[PDB]
């Protein structure tokens, strides 16, 4: 049989608001579910905060025409869509503000560490850099006055890593998370160097979990309970999403 389909595909070949919302939903789901503070979607967030400002002005402008068919369902939908969209962004920001609270001394440690692999301004919004730096002084003043004032000088450090317990609470890198194995974000599987076939045909990624010296194959389109430290590189590269 002569298989034509590549000739038919070459004959056949003759950023958007709908896409950015789908990246906000990915970001919100991964941020809720991950133990780490993920890096902020800088350009995505600037785009969405424009569209909310322009759309909220448009809904008010259309409501000026109603003073003078004149069906109201599209006004109702444009309004309920802004409530649905503003909720995802509020729930997203309130979630990552909660992680800046937990990780203040760890983020301060990445910022005092001049040799760091990460700059804090890669990781945080301008309003999160504001929240972080000032919530740290507000809390530090509270404890520093209220109880640290009385301590001997070598115990006055709020962030002593040398003591009997480390005071800097780091993320739980090995948290178990549920993942759904997307495959590459492009449908074009042949690009990917990590991906490979199996027996039963089906493709997968292989990852080694180093404490146990165990390889595991993450077959595409299936759900695993898996340690986050093993997933990070696949999650940053969009190969998997957190359920």
């Amino acid at each position: 049989d002569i298989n034509i389909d590549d000739i038919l595909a070459e004959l056949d070949k003759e950023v958007s608001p709908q896409q950015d919302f789908s990246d906000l939903m990915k970001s919100w789901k991964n941020e809720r579910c991950s133990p780490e503070l993920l890096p902020y979607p800088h350009q995505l967030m600037k785009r969405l905060l424009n569209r909310i400002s322009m759309q909220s002005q448009l809904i008010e402008n259309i409501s000026m025409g109603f003073l003078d068919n004149e069906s109201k369902l599209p006004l109702l939908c444009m309004e309920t869509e802004l409530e649905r969209l503003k909720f995802v962004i509020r729930s997203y920001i309130r979630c990552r503000l909660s992680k800046i609270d937990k990780f203040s001394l760890y983020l301060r440690q990445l910022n005092e560490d001049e040799n760091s692999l990460i700059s804090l301004t890669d990781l945080l919004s301008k309003d999160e850099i504001k929240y972080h730096d000032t919530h740290s002084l507000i809390w530090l003043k509270l404890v520093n006055d209220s109880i640290l004032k009385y301590m001997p000088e070598e115990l006055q450090a709020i962030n002593d890593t040398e003591g009997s317990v480390n005071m800097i609470d780091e993320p739980d890198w090995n948290k178990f998370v549920f993942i759904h194995v997307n495959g590459p974000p492009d449908g074009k599987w042949n690009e990917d160097p990590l991906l490979q076939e199996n027996e039963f045909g089906k493709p997968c990624y292989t990852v080694t979990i180093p404490d146990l010296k165990e390889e595991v194959e993450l077959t595409i389109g299936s759900i695993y309970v898996m340690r986050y430290e093993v997933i990070r590189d696949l999650l940053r590269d969009d190969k998997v999403a957190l359920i």
């Binding site: 009997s164 480390n166 005071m167 609470d169 739980d172 090995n174």
Partner: protein, 177 residues
């Protein structure tokens, strides 16, 4: 050394570190008699004290011959190991120690013990089956649930409260708006 999953400000870790373990001193030490409840005496070699784990965990490491030996505690005696291995579900761990699993992990760190790590991994996995049955079962409590929650640690009560509210909020959403 300390593991990052148990926190500085974590109240149930602060309380676990407070529990006493039996300790033999390996040295004579002036001034430290307040540990024996008499400040005026020295500590004497082969005194058998009980010290809080936040003191004992550290004195066991430094002095090579260190300041203290930790003696094997009652809660990890072979009696408790045998009771764990026959019937994990029936066992009243909240009477053996209210913080048994947090203390088990600290003991397995402090002396590497593949033996105790097996026994405590199994105790956890077997009691987790019953924690899921009692968390899943929602009234439209029973004695057969309440008799189990009284047998229950301050670690496993978090998992129970959290799992139960997870099933309960799901029922609450499916069977009304």
């Amino acid at each position: 050394s300390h593991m990052a999953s148990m926190g500085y400000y974590d109240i149930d870790d602060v309380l676990a570190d407070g529990t006493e373990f039996p300790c033999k001193f390996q040295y004579d030490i002036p001034g430290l008699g307040y540990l024996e409840n008499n400040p005026g005496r020295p500590i004497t070699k082969n005194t058998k004290l009980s010290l809080p784990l936040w003191l004992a965990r550290i004195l066991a490491i430094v002095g090579p011959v260190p300041f203290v030996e930790l003696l094997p505690p009652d809660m990890f005696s072979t009696k408790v190991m045998n009771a764990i291995k026959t019937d994990p579900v029936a066992l009243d761990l909240h009477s053996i120690n209210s913080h048994f699993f947090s203390l088990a992990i600290k003991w397995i760190m402090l002396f590497s013990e593949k033996e105790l790590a097996n026994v405590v991994s199994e105790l956890l996995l077997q009691r987790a089956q019953e924690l899921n049955h009692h968390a899943s079962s929602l009234s439209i409590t029973n004695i057969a649930t309440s008799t189990f929650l009284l047998k229950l640690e301050e670690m496993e009560k978090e998992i129970y409260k959290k799992s139960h509210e997870s099933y309960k909020d799901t029922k609450r959403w499916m069977f009304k708006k």
